[PDB]
Amino acid sequence: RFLKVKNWETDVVLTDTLHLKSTLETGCTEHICMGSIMLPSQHTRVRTKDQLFPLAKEFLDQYYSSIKRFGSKAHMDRLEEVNKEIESTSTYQLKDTELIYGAKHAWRNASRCVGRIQWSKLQVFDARDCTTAHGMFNYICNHVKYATNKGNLRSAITIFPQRTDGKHDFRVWNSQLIRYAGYKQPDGSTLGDPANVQFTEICIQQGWKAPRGRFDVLPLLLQANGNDPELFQIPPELVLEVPIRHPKFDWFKDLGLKWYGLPAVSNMLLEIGGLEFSACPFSGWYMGTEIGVRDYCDNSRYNILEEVAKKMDLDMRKTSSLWKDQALVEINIAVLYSFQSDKVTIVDHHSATESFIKHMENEYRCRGGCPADWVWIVPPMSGSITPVFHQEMLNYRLTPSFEYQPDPWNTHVW
Amino acid sequence: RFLKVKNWETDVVLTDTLHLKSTLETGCTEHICMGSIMLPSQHTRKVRTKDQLFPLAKEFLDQYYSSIKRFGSKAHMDRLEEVNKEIESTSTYQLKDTELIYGAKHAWRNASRCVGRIQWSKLQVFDARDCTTAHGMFNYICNHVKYATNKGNLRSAITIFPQRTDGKHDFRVWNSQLIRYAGYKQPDGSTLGDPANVQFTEICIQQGWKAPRGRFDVLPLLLQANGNDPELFQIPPELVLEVPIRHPKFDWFKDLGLKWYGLPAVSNMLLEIGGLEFSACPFSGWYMGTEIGVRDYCDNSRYNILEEVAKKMDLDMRKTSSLWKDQALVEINIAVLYSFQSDKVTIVDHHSATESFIKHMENEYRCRGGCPADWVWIVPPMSGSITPVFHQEMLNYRLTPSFEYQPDPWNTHVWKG
Ligand code: HEM
Ligand code: HEM
Ligand SMILES: Cc1cc(N)nc(CCc2c(F)c(F)cc(CCCN(C)C)c2F)c1
Numbered sequence: 001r002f003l004k005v006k007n008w009e010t011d012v013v014l015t016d017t018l019h020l021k022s023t024l025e026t027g028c029t030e031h032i033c034m035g036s037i038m039l040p041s042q043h044t045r046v047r048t049k050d051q052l053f054p055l056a057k058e059f060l061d062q063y064y065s066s067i068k069r070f071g072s073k074a075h076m077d078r079l080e081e082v083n084k085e086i087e088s089t090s091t092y093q094l095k096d097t098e099l100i101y102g103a104k105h106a107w108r109n110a111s112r113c114v115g116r117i118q119w120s121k122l123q124v125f126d127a128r129d130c131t132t133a134h135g136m137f138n139y140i141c142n143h144v145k146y147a148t149n150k151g152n153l154r155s156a157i158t159i160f161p162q163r164t165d166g167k168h169d170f171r172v173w174n175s176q177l178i179r180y181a182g183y184k185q186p187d188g189s190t191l192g193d194p195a196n197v198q199f200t201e202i203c204i205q206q207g208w209k210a211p212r213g214r215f216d217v218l219p220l221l222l223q224a225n226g227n228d229p230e231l232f233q234i235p236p237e238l239v240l241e242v243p244i245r246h247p248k249f250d251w252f253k254d255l256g257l258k259w260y261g262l263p264a265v266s267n268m269l270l271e272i273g274g275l276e277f278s279a280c281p282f283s284g285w286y287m288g289t290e291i292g293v294r295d296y297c298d299n300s301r302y303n304i305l306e307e308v309a310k311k312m313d314l315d316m317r318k319t320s321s322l323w324k325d326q327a328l329v330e331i332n333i334a335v336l337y338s339f340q341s342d343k344v345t346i347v348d349h350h351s352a353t354e355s356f357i358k359h360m361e362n363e364y365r366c367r368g369g370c371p372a373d374w375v376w377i378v379p380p381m382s383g384s385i386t387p388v389f390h391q392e393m394l395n396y397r398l399t400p401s402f403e404y405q406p407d408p409w410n411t412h413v414w
Numbered sequence: 415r416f417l418k419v420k421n422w423e424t425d426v427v428l429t430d431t432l433h434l435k436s437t438l439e440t441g442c443t444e445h446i447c448m449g450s451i452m453l454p455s456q457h458t459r460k461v462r463t464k465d466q467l468f469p470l471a472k473e474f475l476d477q478y479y480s481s482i483k484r485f486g487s488k489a490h491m492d493r494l495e496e497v498n499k500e501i502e503s504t505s506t507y508q509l510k511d512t513e514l515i516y517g518a519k520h521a522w523r524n525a526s527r528c529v530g531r532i533q534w535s536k537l538q539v540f541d542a543r544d545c546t547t548a549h550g551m552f553n554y555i556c557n558h559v560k561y562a563t564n565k566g567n568l569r570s571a572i573t574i575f576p577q578r579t580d581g582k583h584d585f586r587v588w589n590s591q592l593i594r595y596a597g598y599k600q601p602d603g604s605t606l607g608d609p610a611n612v613q614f615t616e617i618c619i620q621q622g623w624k625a626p627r628g629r630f631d632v633l634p635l636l637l638q639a640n641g642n643d644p645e646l647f648q649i650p651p652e653l654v655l656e657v658p659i660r661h662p663k664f665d666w667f668k669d670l671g672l673k674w675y676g677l678p679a680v681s682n683m684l685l686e687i688g689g690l691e692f693s694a695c696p697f698s699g700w701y702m703g704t705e706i707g708v709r710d711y712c713d714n715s716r717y718n719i720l721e722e723v724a725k726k727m728d729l730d731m732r733k734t735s736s737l738w739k740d741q742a743l744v745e746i747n748i749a750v751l752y753s754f755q756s757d758k759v760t761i762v763d764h765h766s767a768t769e770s771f772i773k774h775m776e777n778e779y780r781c782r783g784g785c786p787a788d789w790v791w792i793v794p795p796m797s798g799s800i801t802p803v804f805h806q807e808m809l810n811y812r813l814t815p816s817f818e819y820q821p822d823p824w825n826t827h828v829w830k831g
């Protein structure tokens with residue numbers, strides 16, 4: 001019950017005590033492991049008055065422990081003050097310090113995130129005074145500019161007002177702040193990003209004038225206080241993009257590939273002390289494989305493998321020539337090369353997983369553990385030559401947390 | 415209760431009812447997932463009385479007679495009756511030949527970490543339950559190797575030695591695989607040969623094996639019959655099919671001196687059928703290319719040839735973001751596949767193998783109500799997401815008959831002397 005994880009490449013063994021603090025459920029049982037389910041019910045997300053105070057107490061307890069004020073007057077006073085506020089208002093407000101700690105720890109606890117060694121350097125933008133979609137746009141432009149930083153990317157989260165009665169939710173309808181559009185052709189194929197075909201249609205259905213290109217930056221669709229969402233175009237000078245070329249193949253630039261520099265997830269829900277922040281876009285920097293392996297080479301995405309292997313003149317007759325694997329490596333060399341050339345922050349999967357092993361070491365030593373989801377942590381190429389492949393990981397759910405939530409168009413009372 | 419799994423590349427959704435027939439435990443709880451634990455308590459086998467044995471037998475026989483469309487028949491009830499009296503009077507029981515064949519096929523069919531299970535029904539089962547000595551084991555294993563190898567046209571096979579009785583007369587193959595290369599720790603700390611096999615190599619040498627001390631020395635068989643001290647046997651070299659590894663474009667690749675054997679034959683697992691434990695049950699199939707090209711050759715703790723291969727390719731080795739490791743890895747795996755195909759030795763690449771597993775899995779859901787699958791093990795160790803299993807949700811649960819791990823015998827064996 002005080003669990004051991006072993007690294008089978010190095011024989012390092014770590015003892016996990018942190019999982020005993022786990023609160024939420026995994027979706028597994030003794031009879032069945034659901035470790036490969038993408039979205040179990042638990043990972044998705046009104047709070048009654050009774051559920052809220054224990055959630056607040058557990059959070060304030062760990063907060064005051066983290067500042068070595070556990071059991072202090074200031075601790076008990078804050079517990080009482082929040083306890084009174086919940087009794088009266090049926091909710092409560094976080095102190096700035098508690099909001100910042102909560103957001104950093106939601107990242108720290110994100111068991112699927114390989115980049116968590118950076119978790120404590122997150123820049124938290126308090127947007128809880130926001131009231132309109134235009135204000136949300138302003139907060140998001142400031143986030144994008146701060147985080148992009150002329151290509152020296154910086155981690156950031158912007159936190160909009162917390163859920164109240166569920167009818168006044170703040171929501172960013174986009175899945176990411178910056179994402180390329182997707183159009184169904186009459187021809188039957190897909191232009192641009194197929195993953196965003198439905199969202200691209202909701203944008204057009206709301207007024208957007210699509211250039212119908214291959215890499216059209218989507219507008220923001222912002223919902224404040226539960227109102228109808230509104231379109232806003234992000235200033236192009238704020239959207240850093242990188243043309244993709246290859247350091248050896250001159251024909252690579254002719255493929256016309258580019259990608260955006262800033263990965264900014266915008267559709268998740270931040271849970272702190274029972275409070276639910278339905279609009280909390282956060283951003284870091286890319287691991288190369290997200291673009292090169294998933295975005296460019298997933299069959300349900302840009303799906304460029306065949307085209308690249310063609311230009312490489314690879315034997316595509318048989319799968320055992322591993323033409324897909326060759327092409328895959330070259331595409332991913334090009335992504336890393338392009339970002340590094342344009343001085344846009346990016347990390348290769350080798351450095352990132354090595355960092356995560358170091359991070360796990362640190363968390364086990366200083367925290368007693370590190371929830372980690374192997375299915376997600378292991379990169380989607382060259383898995384076993386990265387150290388995380390050989391790392392046993394314990395997956396459990398700690399709070400504060402980032403959770404998934406239903407897409408807004410399914411829920412929005414129009 | 416029904417459970418759904420989704421393929422996120424095709425949106426195909428399958429419904430699992432088979433997990434309801436699951437008896438054993440996973441290691442996970444509502445509060446922790448142990449999905450990535452390599453050798454969890456539940457997948458191993460350290461010792462079993464007449465108390466729990468008849469329901470295990472009854473459950474198996476019910477499954478068996480259902481599969482042959484004889485559930486509730488007179489043959490079914492008489493067999494249950496017969497097994498029951500044999501248990502209470504002798505404390506164990508013997509499987510019929512048909513039941514053993516069924517049991518071994520279904521143990522493979524239930525192996526949730528095995529990507530090659532489309533083949534499960536075409537398993538050649540060799541009954542070695544009349545074996546009594548290590549020499550008899552050697553003879554059975556030789557015949558298995560020769561049959562399974564079939565001059566490179568590999569055929570799946572399993573050889574099943576007598577079941578455990580009191581845990582003091584076990585049959586065991588001390589080798590982890592029937593064919594495997596020696597590993598030698600040198601005084602300077604480096605390893606010659608396969609570092610994974612250093613401990614077993616040292617046992618063989620202690621038992622009298624004259625080691626050639628090369629990089630690819632086929633290990634001797636260390637065979638334990640009836641709980642006696644194990645004995646050394648050399649597999650006839652004419653029975654050990656090997657492939658020199660060359661590359662279709664890089665002529666310097668052959669000069670690395672690499673080869674591998676053609677027949678992957680796991681020999682240290684435990685086969686559980688109807689509560690009976692078969693502690694010596696070597697089984698063999700054919701290789702997926704990445705087992706050799708990725709894991710055997712490129713694991714840092716194995717042959718670890720990435721450095722020298724990338725040196726000879728003249729890749730940028732100063733920074734990892736050149737992906738020199740990924741580039742060399744692909745070329746090594748091309749070479750492995752090219753060499754086996756050129757020598758007409760059966761092998762499957764990870765694209766073909768994972769595509770077949772998806773078809774197998776969908777078929778199993780339709781005809782069986784499910785297919786237990788361990789994503790962590792099914793996804794190949796390179797190019798994971800450009801194979802279709804990466805995108806496939808999988809439910810992992812334990813069905814019997816099963817293959818289980820057991821502790822290495824040198825840690826449990828009571829030495830006779
Ligand atoms: C700073 C550089 C970062 C890197 C290199 C990184 C890396 C990654 C990668 C590769 C994934 C898998 C994503 C996918 O395959 O779709 C992921 C997931 C995730 N990241 Fe990080 N990330 C970074 C920053 C952040 C930040 C700043 C946050 C939050 C403040 C965060 C929260 C998450 C969460 C919650 C997930 C998993 C979503 C889920 O549960 O399904 N990441 N990360
Ligand atoms: C016919 C071709 C076969 C292929 C291509 C194949 C492929 C594989 C691969 C790649 C693995 C992962 C192994 C590793 O990474 O160490 C595996 C695991 C496994 N295979 Fe198969 N296999 C085949 C035949 C068989 C047969 C004949 C049996 C038994 C009769 C079998 C039983 C298993 C079991 C029990 C495991 C899991 C070991 C564990 O639980 O840790 N396989 N297979
Ligand atoms: C901050 C950051 C850093 C980084 N390197 N990458 C990203 C984008 C990758 C990414 C997430 F991080 C995330 F939390 C959620 C998703 C959606 C998953 C949808 N999928 C289940 C179908 C996602 F795509 C963000």
Ligand SMILES: Cc1cc(N)nc(CCc2c(F)c(F)cc(CCCN(C)C)c2F)c1
Nearest residue numbers: 452530678679680697698699700701702705
């Ligand atoms: C029949 C067959 C077909 C095929 N293609 N490959 C193989 C070898 C791979 C393999 C198994 F299949 C298996 F069941 C067990 C192990 C031991 C795992 C040790 N691990 C905990 C460190 C193993 F290595 C065998």
Ligand SMILES: C[C@H](O)[C@H](O)[C@H]1CNc2nc(N)[nH]c(=O)c2N1
Nearest residue numbers: 036037038375376804805806807
């Ligand atoms: C079905 C499976 O869980 C799904 O394809 C997962 C696999 N692992 C992943 N890992 C990461 N990092 N990102 C993903 O989207 C996925 N997809």
Ligand SMILES: C[C@H](O)[C@H](O)[C@H]1CNc2nc(N)[nH]c(=O)c2N1
Nearest residue numbers: 389390391392450451452790791
């Ligand atoms: C720690 C982790 O479970 C371990 O490295 C696993 C990962 N997946 C694997 N998958 C296969 N096929 N074979 C393995 O040996 C492993 N090792």
Ligand SMILES: [Zn+2]
Nearest residue numbers: 028033442447
């Ligand atoms: Zn699990």
